[PDB]
Ligand binder design. Structure first.
Ligand SMILES: CCCCCCCCCCCCC/C=C/[C@H](O)[C@H](N)CO
Lengths: 245, 58, 297, 50, 58
């Protein structure tokens, strides 16, 4: 079939019964770095099963007036489990990801979500309203952490770029009439074979409700949204002591 | 006609035809590219491809 | 030595990238085949599912009755070279006789192509680019006349001593490349290679260059990519005394040998700052035009 | 003279009537065959769709 | 000598000899045409042609 799926990796498993296939980012699977492309000389580590597993980060509430949220990678995991420990202890980093978004409702609820992956998603500021002020986004806005951050101008995605063209990026829709989950597989996206896991963020994940949630009075009003994700083919290098940030 | 191999498109799958008068290969003309496309990489990036005639969700 | 089954049969180390898609030649547009009516159940190409994230693949032959057209329309003009290998203005340097901007007869211009909207919008459709360049220097007075003046251009790579005055010793150019040209001559034109420490220039960089506490003073580091800092371009009027004519210099850039990765949405707001995607918050305008009603034209 | 593909491959002019059914001789009534019990799932001839 | 085939007289019966230095074929010289005529297409556009020696109307 196609509507039913089960994803198993490491010591975790995700089952679903309202799937909509699986999107592979740019038609490419995650992979390790080859010997002709690597530039550092020390032997990298590949912890395998202890880091390649599904992590559930947090839950958000979908309301009739919600605007949207974004998460930054791998900032969400820089402080979770063995993956977070390895990312703190090492200088270099390289991995892909497997994202699963959970959101379920009844057959009498309606609404649509756009789930997209935008690499190098630099967040711009409002520049003081008039535009004569040279401002930069603060820490809680550029690197919100594992708790996410809410969009202020979802029509421009806080960067002056229209949301109507966000579908050129790897994406899936969560339409409550049809499905209740989304899966996007992202390979490693960078111009360098290895990069820092703490200073640099590779991509950002966007969840914006295009069609407002609506239901009749009496039905369940609490509709949560959940994010689950698993690193794939992780490598680390340049071992030293741990650094907090 | 002995020159350095230092253009920006070396180590690429496609070959150009260009004109150069110097020993550095990045001074040449733009030339003609080859006409190849991979539209599926953006338009149909799914895991299991489905035929046109059927229903995408069954 | 591998002896355990989970290491013998392990898939760790696969460095090759599994590609689901392949490139096929397409010199012209696709032809149209003959089609006829169809009256049957179970086979419906009109109905799709946009939730999956894939573009709908219904064609002409499956929806309406069509004739055979031998399409011979070329696709040669939409290539990256054809789109980008056109010159455009990227910087201006002003050398007035009296003023506060460049009062000494010399100027330093940091090389970046995000200073002008026409070029910036075109180049920011993508995230990474790797290309060669071709720079042209057109010099004239504010009234536009050409005068007998001798100028010197110098390329200063990062780490080299920047000139501080018109009589600085850096103008000996023992190692830096330089151009001596007269205004009566045709514009100067030089070819520049790909100079990045990385494999591509990235116009967007979601990160900071250094560790530490990210306070107010250490906040401009966001989006600042050190790998796009390609040095300085220095100009001066050759002579020990002050010049006779005020001069304006315009720089034009033409790309070639281009490769691009990761397309992104085009900008729809007015630009405010360089290397900074900020937008006027209180003056947001729609992408397109508007109309009175949805049922009328 | 036919030269265009949509005229060459055209189906205009088919005067023969496509018959989905054919006549079979039936001089007597139909016989009855032996039958036995059946206890299985997925194969139901009792349920129809009028 | 590898150039685009984008002159105004491509897809024509007659061939020219021209000189070009660029990759676009419409930048070349005018060259020499071929000397062919079809005067009947304007002078004698009749259905049934008649000989000189006879009477056109009989
Ligand atoms: C005597 C020669 C003088 C002419 C000097 C021109 C050299 C130009 C330096 C290379 C320019 C590279 C093109 C742009 C690279 C970076 O991406 C931009 N700075 C973007 O900000």
């Amino acid at each position: 079939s196609d509507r039913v799926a089960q994803l198993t990796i490491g010591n975790s498993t995700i089952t679903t019964q309202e799937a909509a296939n699986i999107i592979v980012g740019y038609g490419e699977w995650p992979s390790y770095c080859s010997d002709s492309d690597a530039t550092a000389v020390d032997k990298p580590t590949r912890p395998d099963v202890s880091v390649n597993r599904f992590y559930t980060l947090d839950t958000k509430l979908w309301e009739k007036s919600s605007k949207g949220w974004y998460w930054k990678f791998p900032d969400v995991l820089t402080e979770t489990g063995v993956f977070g420990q390895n990312a703190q202890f090492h200088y270099l980093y390289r991995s892909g990801f497997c994202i699963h978004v959970q959101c379920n409702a009844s057959k009498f609820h309606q609404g649509a979500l756009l789930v997209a992956v935008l690499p190098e998603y630099v967040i711009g500021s409002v520049a003081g309203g008039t535009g004569t002020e040279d401002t930069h986004p603060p820490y809680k806005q550029t690197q919100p952490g594992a708790d996410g951050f809410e969009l202020q101008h979802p029509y421009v995605l806080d960067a002056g770029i229209p949301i109507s063209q966000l579908t050129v990026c790897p994406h899936q829709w969560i339409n409550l009439r049809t499905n209740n989950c989304a899966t996007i597989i992202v390979p490693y996206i960078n111009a360098l074979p290895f990069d820092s896991a703490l200073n640099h963020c590779n991509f950002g994940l966007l969840v914006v409700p295009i069609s407002p949630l609506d239901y009749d009075q009496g039905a369940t009003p609490v509709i949560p949204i959940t994010i689950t994700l698993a690193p794939m083919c992780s490598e680390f290098a340049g071992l030293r002591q741990a650094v907090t940030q | 006609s002995h020159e350095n191999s230092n253009s920006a498109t070396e180590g690429s799958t496609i070959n150009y035809t260009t004109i150069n008068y110097y020993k550095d290969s990045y001074a040449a003309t733009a030339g003609k590219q080859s006409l190849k496309q991979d539209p599926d990489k953006f338009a149909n990036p799914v895991k299991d491809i489905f035929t046109e005639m059927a229903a995408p969700l069954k | 030595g591998d002896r355990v089954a989970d290491v013998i049969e392990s898939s760790i180390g696969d460095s090759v990238s599994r590609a689901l898609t392949r490139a096929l030649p397409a010199p012209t547009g696709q032809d149209t085949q003959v089609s006829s009516h169809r009256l049957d159940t179970g086979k419906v190409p009109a109905l799709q599912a946009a939730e999956i994230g894939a573009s709908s693949n219904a064609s002409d032959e499956s929806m309406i009755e069509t004739r055979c057209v031998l399409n011979s329309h070329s696709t040669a003009e939409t290539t990256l070279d054809s789109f980008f290998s056109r010159a455009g203005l990227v910087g201006e340097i002003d050398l007035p006789l009296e003023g506060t901007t460049n009062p000494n007869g010399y100027a330093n211009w940091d090389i970046d192509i995000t200073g002008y909207a026409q070029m910036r919008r075109k180049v920011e459709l993508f995230t990474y680019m790797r290309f060669d360049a071709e720079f042209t220097f057109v010099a004239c007075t504010p009234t536009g006349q050409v005068v007998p003046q001798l100028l010197q251009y110098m390329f200063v790579p990062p780490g080299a001593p920047e000139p501080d005055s018109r009589e600085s010793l850096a103008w000996q150019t023992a190692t830096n490349p330089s151009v001596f040209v007269k205004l009566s001559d045709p514009p100067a034109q030089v070819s520049v290679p790909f100079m990045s420490p990385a494999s591509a220039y990235q116009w967007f960089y979601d990160g900071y260059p250094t560790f530490g506490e990210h306070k107010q003073e250490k906040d401009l580091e966001y989006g600042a990519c050190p790998n796009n800092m390609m040095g300085t371009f220095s100009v001066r009027t050759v002579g020990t005394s002050k010049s006779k004519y005020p001069l304006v210099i315009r720089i034009y850039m033409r790309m070639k040998h281009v490769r691009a990765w990761i397309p992104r949405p085009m900008r729809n707001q007015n630009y405010l700052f360089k290397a900074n995607p900020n937008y006027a918050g209180n003056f947001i305008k729609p992408t397109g035009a508007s109309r009175t009603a949805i049922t009328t034209l």
